[PDB]
Design a protein around this nucleic acid. Structure first.
Ligand code: CTP
Ligand code: MG
Ligand code: MG
Ligand code: ZN
Lengths: 435, 250, 652, 85, 59, 219, 54, 217
RNA sequence: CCGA
């Protein structure tokens, strides 16, 4: 059998359990999880893993990181007093500055854990997936950053201390704002979650699998869900429990799978390694009398085979949609009361040089949310960093349509200048109009 | 136990009359409330094979009601298995669970074949397993299979398979994270950042090539055979794989 | 206080007054502030008590700013609040400063040491659990406190405070006598084993002896959750932050048997039972010793009037007050008529209505006070006599009880181990309790490790520290430096050098009790202050076979006090429908609730060992049909069979 | 109302009562059944048993007296003696 | 631990997971009605015996 | 292989400390002997304790006596901590007559011949000027911790029967030009005074020997 | 709106807006043929899904 | 005071014995004591026999290849370390081997003296080709513990004296009519095939009893 | 009002 000559964490244990539920069944899988349970309990007791005050190790670059952050806030407010920027982009600049410094300090905490002490207790608890995210380890070691109002408004002040050093009275009041956010939202939005669940149950309480096949030719086109240049759900994950409606052919011409063929993960990988657009059978395109058939629904995900006649799939669908919103609403208070934001990716030059003028690109100067004038790309073209290397110093950045440029046509680049940045998505920014 | 005499009371009353101990419901109820050592053996042989549904509120999805086979514990709390705890979203800091007893035979056959907790591994929302190690078994398996440069006793020694290294660990010869060469002729070996390229090659006599990898050492024949193979691993990884192998193949 | 608030639906509605706050004559809340003149905190006279006159006018600084003694405010930037905005100014522009760093928080939140190293939600949970601790048998002061415990014990009212100078002349367990000197004997009564609103003990103990001087304000007697004149809610026990064999898995708790046999966490709970001998139309109810269908030795503890005596032991089902009432219908079925034709069996005119102990609730009877109208009392109307019975019980610690600290770290005891199986220290002393270390960094309550290390330093020194919150005003890493310096000074004792290791500071070596082998990694040990909460398993366990039913719906009742059933709500119906399980759902809705013929048939089929028959229409559906007909809607059920429609009768 | 426990106890008492009464002579069994309403649902007097039969009510009282004396035997009648409350 | 193996192999080889449950319940009712005499054993309930017999006829 | 007592210091009677040395043993055998001795010395040694109390004029445990500073619960807790030694395996009866004022200690107990009090300066109660405390207790023998049964006028005590209070041991190594090296076991035994540490060591030793002899004999 | 525009007045009345649904059902004179999970739970029958399907 | 029961006794075809033992009734906590002491003495202090030095005629050094044999000298030492045998002499014994190919070499081709004895006769050693013949001599020793040879005349190999390969124990609680909580010790012993699991229990019990008897004075 |  397979030997697994590596370190085991939570996701690899989940992979092993999911593999044992392919060729053995439910009971052998539960027996394997039972044996792994008693083995993990025995060696966690034998280890004697413990948490202490000195076990929380703060990286020694936090001082200069905070100093660079306050120097950036100082030059931002110096730019505000001169008169070339306005107040809303100053707000946006100071908020994004403190968020970026918090994320940079979190990455430095993870690197300093990996360098000095790899068998640290807090790092073992967070890295193996036993208990704890990296947000809580960032709040314990690093800085807390910014909190949030109970309505979702953003506060103005930073918290430059962690829980090991101890907060001040002002920082404790600022943290109490976010604690009141978590408590009020836990007490007040679970009604919204449960009302949505009850409405979803009542809209689909009569969707039962009544017949084996409806005999339709209509199909649903499935592509990989992408928001920008990086994927969110791949094609192999999206073809997981479906039946086929059209035959998948390769470039050589051999048929990978026929129609009405159930797809599993192996066949889904074999299909997704060939094409990009697959036509499947869906409940959207089923033709049955106010219900779904056995072939258009596909697999029972709890069991791993095709569904059975008389299954209340509408109740299962409504519970599947209504469970995570209610659970996440009731466990929002685990994160303290901090603000979570998505930092837009920046691609910088490693050393001095200039920039290759992109071929096949027109661009317009568009006023950034932070105040600097930048040129936004219209049609996507390449960018290449022109380094000052006599042998090999060259990096190429292919742009997303909608990125921003802080670089002119052939201008000389300093040591460490800002080069490019793609703006956020619509849902990933989560902004709304105000005054 | 005091919860179980109340929930299974007519089944105990039926058994006390079938065994010829009492003759009616009044004597059975009197002997049940008065306390007897006969009642506990009767209840032990009554609850055997009778499934019991457990429920924790809020019931957000299907796995909030699951069926179990009860065993009589002494005390007043209900003992829950630690693997079904993410399915209930239940921790042991104040949660209470309701208990329901099916009465009919169709209702006991449905609790056993459709709702028993050893058949509810996969989620119904995704295809991913709900029943999986968490929060101490994950940390115990991470510590068991990790690398540790400090604990190196008997490092670099050669052992004749898995059972030889397992005997050396229980004898006290090696540490848990010692770098250990293991004679292992199988080729289903998966490592972190898996290597298939040869680093170096030392030629031996009789037409025999000694191929070196990052975590493997393969000695093969000249034309059409492989002779032996050594794998560098820790004893804790050997314990983990022996646990998997004796759990699966049975 | 921004921390102390309910967690339920009334979050942010019910607040708490802060520590130094005060309500003026017009009803507005005011807070004291020290004046600041030329950058120097004044502290010469009483403070100002600004009644929210400090937003538009004054620049107010918190009470945690660094300041050299008898001198100015050090630093060139002082954090101020001004016009409801936070800002920073120079010390010569500061108008007022706070008087205490704990001015922002309430009393129960000020009870928590190292508060600035914990999350605010965990501070809220710590305050809430501190208000839920039971008073123990032998209370003990914390090794690490904050300093408000003495004032809280003085202002609670559970402490007998002296008033005059004098010499104590007589002390026993019920009375303290003192002659004053500066109508010459002040008698302080001491209450003994009274009942609170939550069925807990209110007991007082004397502290002073005969023949010593007493200052006004000296504590003479201390209450139930008070010892030494200070608040004492829990005990100091030896922790080890380590995982056991899955017994402290997800906030569960492993403890030893020493906390059982040493009477640690033993509490007293007094229950109260009341019975009224009412007046019925068929005759008066009488409280008597002659009860039908009751044996010989079920009346040993009753007196000549049918009431128990003081000091009798009672268990579940024992008779407290024997009472009968004159039933007068006498409608007997033929079975009872034939059985009384055969075996004699003269049916009496009264029936049993005695007061009995509920399921569980064993204990000792301590007060059997009886109220009768012709004794001088006057009663509720329609009742002849009223008997009140107080039953006290000593509850030890148990598997299933709730346990908590001051930092929001709750847990349920799941295993009680022997001390030869508990892990032990390199002096041979076993550990009292093992807590799971994974509950610390995810919940972000780091101050419990500071508290346990400081309590263990104070245990090895014997000094009983007191540290006010927000102590980082005196320097950077002040709590860490204080804890490790006191651990070093405790390790400099001539016999105790295993206490602190400089290679790994907060940790030492721990050995296994079962094998003798040391654990592979050093473990944080300490002395934590743990609490026992009101949520005990005896008040939580409940079960029903068949009890009473509701009036109209004819469904089982709800509640522990009336032997009620569990509610199988709509989400449970959805969960059973998402499975198969049509027969489980059908028997849960018909033969277990509001189908009376199905109830009787199912019970008879289970008792006689036969198949349970098919149920009928439930009772609440017929109630809905009659209600919709009474609204004026012609709603009816119909049945089609061989080209024929006919209205069916659901009432049958 | 009446509990299901009381219903099942009186039904088992009725079944055990009929199974005990049908062991004695067939005449006295139906005399005791028509006397207390175990089949009719109507308790009757001594004379109306004499109109069910034609022998008058003095033999009927002696019949039910000796039937109660036979059912009051200490041997082979203690199955019904456990329902004594 | 063999009864959960027999239940898994009985559910996996059935054409419908909801019809095999009704068939097991019907055979368990027949096993309980045929064994109405008191000579039995508590470790072999009628439902367990029905699952055992149906898995043995399944092979 | 010889035992040897190194240091044996004592308190008044409250603690009897002793340090015993064991050499030579094999490598793991020191840990086996030490852990078996520690578990048996902490769990399976019998001693004497007070199991019941009767006070004249007192019916329940939540009462008071006029002139006594302590109630019945604190008196029962003080008698729970009493250190005695019983030479018989039968339940004995002790008595007490006390007239205030003064401090009532354990020296005032009129005890029979088989039961003798270890610590006579142990505190019981304080009596005022017009007080009279006349009580009577029961002394039994047991192993471990005794939980009370279901409940004339005897107030029961959940007594503890452990005379050895703390066991500690370390194992040291002997390294020379003396191959196949050996180990040295040093053992620290603290008692309450009712048993000596040498007698407790002999009791644990033949308890372990009687455990392991029929495994060798009956195989 | 799709929950209230179903063919069954019992499910729509038990969900939401009972007065309006019962008024339009009484004026339209409509029948409920007991086709769905929610009606058979109120009636007390086997639900037409799962083991009560056929 | 307790009764010892042999629950099951299995023997695999490669001469490896397994026997489950049950001990009841013990007092509270004594089952862990007896089980841990028995496990430590059964795994650490129990004398067995092994091979210590081999000598193959026709090798260069300690790490080389042997002419005609597929298995080189490292897996020759690794196959000889797996050789299960029993001896009755404290003095050294010398075993010899001659064999000629083609074919496989088993443990039955040793003409070892009668003071030693081979447990598994069909124990694999080597394979041969084209009629090449192998000559070697090994040295049998008995003792306790293990010897590790640094850096790899007679060629000293790694030695393990371990007649019992695995000991597991679980403790079960006994609740009865009396108030005394009791213990039941369930013991599992896996031996090499040289001795029985029932007699290896008696050896460890004899060692523990001789350890604890002179302390009682 | 509190607990999950
Ligand atoms: N108003 C509420 C509050 C709580 N819950 C349930 O109770 C659980 C509360 O868990 P609890 O143990 O109180 O808190 P945790 O989330 O475990 O966090 P912590 O460990 O910090 O207490 C939640 O998952 C939720 O399902 C709920 O349904 N409704
Ligand atoms: Mg919880
Ligand atoms: Mg929790
Ligand atoms: Zn379809």
């Amino acid at each position: 059998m397979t030997f697994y000559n590596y370190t085991i964490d939570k996701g690899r244990l989940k992979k092993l359990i999911a593999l044992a539920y392919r060729r053995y069944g439910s009971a052998r899988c539960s027996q394997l999880a039972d044996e792994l349970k008693e083995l993990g309990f025995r060696f966690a007791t034998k280890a004697g893993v413990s948490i202490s005050v000195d076990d929380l190790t703060i990286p020694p670059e936090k001082k200069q990181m905070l100093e660079a952050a306050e120097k950036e806030i100082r030059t931002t407010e110096e730019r505000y007093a001169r008169g070339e920027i306005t107040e809303v982009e100053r707000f946006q600049k100071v908020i994004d500055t403190w968020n970026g410094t918090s994320e940079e300090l979190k990455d430095q905490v993870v690197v300093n854990f990996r360098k000095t002490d790899p068998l640290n207790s807090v790092y073992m608890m967070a890295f193996s997936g036993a208990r704890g995210n990296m947000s809580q380890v960032r709040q314990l070691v690093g800085m807390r950053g910014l909190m949030a109002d109970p309505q979702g408004e953003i506060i103005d002040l930073p918290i430059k201390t962690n829980f090991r050093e101890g907060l001040t009275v002002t920082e404790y009041v600022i943290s109490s704002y976010g604690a009141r956010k978590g408590l009020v939202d836990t007490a007040l939005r679970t009604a919204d979650s449960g009302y949505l669940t009850r409405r979803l149950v009542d809209v689909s309480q009569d969707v039962i699998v009544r017949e084996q096949d409806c005999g339709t030719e209509r199909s649903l086109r499935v592509t990989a869900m992408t928001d920008g240049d990086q994927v969110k759900i791949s094609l192999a994950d999206r073809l997981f429990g479906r039946l086929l409606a059209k035959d998948v052919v390769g470039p050589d011409g051999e048929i990978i799978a026929k129609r009405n063929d159930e797809i599993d993960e192996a066949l889904a990988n074999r299909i997704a390694a060939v094409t990009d657009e697959v036509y499947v059978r869906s409940p959207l395109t089923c033709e049955a009398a106010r219900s779904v058939c056995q072939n258009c629904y596909g697999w029972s995900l709890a069991h791993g085979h095709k569904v059975d006649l008389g299954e209340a799939v509408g109740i299962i669908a409504a519970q599947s949609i209504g469970e995570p919103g209610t659970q996440l609403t009731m466990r929002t208070f685990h994160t303290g009361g901090v603000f979570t934001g998505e930092v837009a990716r920046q691609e910088k030059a490693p050393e001095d040089g200039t920039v290759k003028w992109g071929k096949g690109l027109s661009t317009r100067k568009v006023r950034t949310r932070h105040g600097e004038d930048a040129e936004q790309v219209e049609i996507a073209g390449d960018l290449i960093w022109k380094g000052e290397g006599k042998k090999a110093a060259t990096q190429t950045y292919s742009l997303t349509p909608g990125s921003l440029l802080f670089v002119q046509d052939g201008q000389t680049v300093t040591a460490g200048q800002l080069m490019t940045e793609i703006s956020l998505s619509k849902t990933q920014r989560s902004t709304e109009r105000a005054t | 136990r005091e919860m179980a005499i109340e929930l299974f009371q007519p089944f105990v009353i039926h058994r006390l009359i079938k065994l010829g101990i009492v003759n009616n419901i009044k004597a059975a109820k009197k002997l049940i409330l008065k306390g007897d050592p006969q009642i506990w053996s009767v209840l032990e042989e009554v609850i055997t094979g009778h499934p019991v549904m457990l429920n924790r509120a809020p019931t957000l999805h299907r796995l909030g009601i699951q069926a179990f086979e009860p065993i009589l514990v002494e005390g007043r709390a209900i003992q829950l298995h630690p693997l079904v705890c993410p399915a209930f979203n239940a921790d042991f800091d104040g949660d209470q669970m309701a208990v329901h007893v099916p009465l009919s035979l169709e209702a006991q056959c449905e609790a056993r074949l459709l709702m028993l907790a050893c058949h509810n591994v996969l989620s119904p929302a995704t295809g991913k397993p709900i029943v999986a190690p968490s929060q101490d078994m994950v940390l115990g398996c991470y510590y068991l299979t990790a690398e540790n440069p400090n604990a190196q006793k008997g490092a670099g020694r050669y052992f004749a398979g898995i059972e030889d290294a397992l005997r050396a660990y229980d004898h006290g010869q090696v540490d848990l994270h010692s770098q250990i060469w293991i004679r292992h002729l199988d080729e289903d070996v998966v490592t972190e950042k898996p290597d298939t390229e040869v680093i170096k090659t030392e030629d031996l006599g009789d037409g025999t090539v000694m191929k070196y990898y990052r975590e493997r050492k393969i000695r093969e024949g000249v034309d059409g055979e492989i002779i032996t193979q050594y794998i560098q691993t820790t004893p804790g990884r050997i314990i983990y794989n022996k646990t998997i192998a004796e759990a699966l193949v049975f | 206080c921004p921390v102390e608030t309910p967690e339920g639906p009334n979050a942010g509605l019910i607040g708490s007054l802060a520590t130094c706050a005060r309500v003026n004559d017009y009803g507005f809340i005011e807070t004291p502030y020290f004046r600041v003149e030329s950058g120097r905190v004044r502290k010469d006279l009483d403070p100002v008590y600004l009644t929210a006159d400090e937003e538009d006018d004054m620049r107010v600084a918190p009470g945690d700013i660094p300041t050299d003694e008898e001198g100015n405010i050090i630093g060139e930037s002082v954090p101020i609040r001004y016009r409801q905005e936070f800002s920073t100014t120079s010390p010569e522009q500061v108008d007022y400063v706070a008087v205490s760093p704990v001015q922002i928080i309430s009393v129960a939140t000020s009870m928590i040491p190292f508060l600035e190293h914990d999350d605010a939600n965990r501070a809220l949970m710590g305050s809430n659990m501190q208000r839920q601790a039971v008073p123990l048998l032998r209370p003990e002061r914390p090794l690490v406190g904050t300093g408000l415990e003495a004032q809280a014990a003085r202002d609670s009212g559970m402490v007998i405070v002296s008033r005059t100078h004098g010499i104590v002349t007589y002390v026993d367990a019920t009375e303290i006598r003192v002659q004053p000197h500066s109508g010459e004997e002040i008698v302080y009564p001491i209450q003994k084993y009274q009942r609170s609103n939550q069925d807990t003990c209110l007991n007082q103990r004397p502290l002073v002896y005969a023949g010593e001087d007493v200052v006004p304000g000296q504590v003479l007697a201390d209450g139930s959750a008070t010892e030494g004149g200070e608040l004492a809610l829990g005990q100091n026990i030896l922790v080890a932050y380590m995982p056991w064999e899955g017994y402290n898995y997800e906030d569960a708790i492993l403890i030893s048997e020493r906390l059982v046999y040493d009477d640690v966490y033993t509490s007293i709970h007094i229950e109260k039972f009341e019975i009224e001998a009412r007046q019925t139309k068929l005759g008066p109810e009488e409280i008597t010793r002659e009860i039908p269908n009751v044996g010989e030795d079920a009346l040993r503890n009753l007196d000549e009037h049918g009431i128990i005596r003081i000091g009798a032991w009672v268990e579940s089902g024992d008779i407290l007050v024997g009472k009968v009432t004159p039933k007068g219908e006498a409608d007997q079925p033929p079975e009872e008529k034939l059985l009384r034709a055969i075996f004699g069996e003269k049916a009496r005119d009264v029936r049993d209505n005695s007061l009995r102990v509920p399921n569980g609730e064993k204990g000792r009877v301590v007060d059997v006070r009886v109220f009768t109208r012709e004794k001088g009392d006057e009663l509720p109307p329609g009742a002849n006599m009223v008997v009140r019975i107080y039953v006290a019980q000593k509850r030890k610690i148990q598997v299933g009880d709730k346990m908590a600290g001051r930092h929001g770290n709750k847990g349920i005891i799941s295993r009680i181990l022997p001390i030869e199986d508990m892990p032990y220290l390199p002096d041979g002393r076993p550990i009292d309790i093992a807590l799971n270390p994974l509950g610390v960094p995810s919940r972000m309550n780091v101050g419990q490790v500071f508290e346990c290390l400081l309590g263990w330093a104070g245990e090895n020194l014997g000094v009983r520290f007191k540290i006010t919150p927000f102590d980082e005003m005196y320097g950077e890493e002040a709590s860490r430096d204080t804890v490790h310096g006191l651990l070093e000074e405790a390790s400099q004792r001539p016999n105790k050098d295993w206490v602190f290791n400089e290679n790994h500071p907060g940790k030492i070596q721990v050995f296994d009790g079962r094998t003798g082998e040391p654990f592979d990694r050093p473990i944080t040990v300490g002395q934590a202050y743990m609490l026992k909460l009101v949520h005990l398993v005896d008040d939580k366990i409940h079960a029903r076979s068949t009890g009473p039913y509701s009036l109209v719906t004819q469904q089982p009742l709800g509640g522990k006090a009336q032997q009620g059933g569990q509610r199988f709500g709509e989400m449970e119906v959805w969960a059973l429908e998402a499975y198969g399980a049509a027969y489980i759902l059908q028997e849960l809705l018909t033969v277990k609730s509001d189908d009376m013929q199905g109830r009787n048939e199912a019970l008879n089929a289970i008792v006689k060992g036969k198949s349970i028959p098919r149920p009928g229409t439930p009772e609440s559906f017929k109630v809905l049909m009659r209600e919709l007909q009474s609204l004026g809607l012609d709603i009816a059920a119909h049945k089609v069979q061989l080209s024929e429609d006919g209205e069916s009768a659901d009432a049958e | 109302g009446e509990t299901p426990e009381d219903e099942v106890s009186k039904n088992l008492l009725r079944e055990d009562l009929e199974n005990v009464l049908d062991t004695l002579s067939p005449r006295e069994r139906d005399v005791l059944r028509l006397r207390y309403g175990l089949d009719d649902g109507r308790m009757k007097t001594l004379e109306e048993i004499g109109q069910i039969f034609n022998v008058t009510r003095e033999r009927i009282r002696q019949i039910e007296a000796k039937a109660l004396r036979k059912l009051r035997h200490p041997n082979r009648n203690s199955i019904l003696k456990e329902y004594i409350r | 631990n063999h009864i959960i193996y027999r239940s898994e192999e009985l559910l996996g080889a059935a054409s419908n997971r909801y019809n095999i449950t009704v068939r097991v319940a019907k055979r368990a009712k027949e096993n309980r009605s045929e064994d109405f005499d008191s000579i039995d054993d508590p470790n072999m309930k009628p439902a367990i015996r029905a699952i055992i017999e149906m898995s043995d006829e399944l092979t | 292989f010889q035992i040897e007592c190194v240091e044996s210091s004592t308190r008044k009677n409250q603690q009897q400390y002793s340090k015993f040395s064991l050499e030579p043993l094999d490598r793991g055998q020191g840990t086996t002997v030490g852990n078996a001795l520690r578990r048996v010395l902490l769990s399976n040694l019998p001693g004497a304790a007070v199991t019941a109390i009767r006070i004249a004029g007192v019916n329940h445990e939540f009462a008071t006596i006029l002139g006594v500073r302590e109630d019945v619960l604190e008196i029962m807790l003080n008698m729970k901590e009493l250190v005695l030694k019983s030479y018989t395996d039968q339940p004995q009866i002790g008595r007490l007559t006390a007239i205030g004022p003064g401090t009532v200690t354990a020296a005032q107990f009129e005890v029979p011949s088989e039961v003798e009090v270890i610590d006579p300066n142990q505190y019981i109660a304080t009596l005022a000027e017009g007080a009279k405390l006349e009580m009577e207790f029961r002394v039994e023998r047991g192993v471990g911790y005794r939980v009370i049964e279901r409940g004339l006028d005897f107030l029961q005590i959940d007594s503890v029967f452990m005379p050895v209070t703390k066991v500690n041991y370390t194992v040291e190594d002997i390294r020379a030009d003396g191959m196949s090296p050996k180990d040295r076991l040093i053992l620290d035994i603290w008692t309450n005074g009712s048993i000596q540490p040498r007698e407790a060591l002999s009791e644990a030793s033949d308890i372990i020997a009687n455990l392991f002899i029929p495994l060798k004999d009956l195989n | 709106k799709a929950s209230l525009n179903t063919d069954s007045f019992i499910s729509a009345a038990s969900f939401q807006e009972t007065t309006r649904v019962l008024t339009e059902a009484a004026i339209e004179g409509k029948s409920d043929w007991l086709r769905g999970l929610k009606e058979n739970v109120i009636i007390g029958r086997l639900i037409p899904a799962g083991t009560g399907f056929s």
